[PDB]
Amino acid sequence: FVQWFSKFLGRIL
Numbered sequence: 001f002v003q004w005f006s007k008f009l010g011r012i013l
Contacts (some may be wrong), residue, residue, distance in 0.1 A: 006013075
């Protein structure tokens with residue numbers, strides 16, 4: 001589970 005790594009990457013991925 002990742003919320004901080006996706007809050008910045010999930011926005012580009």
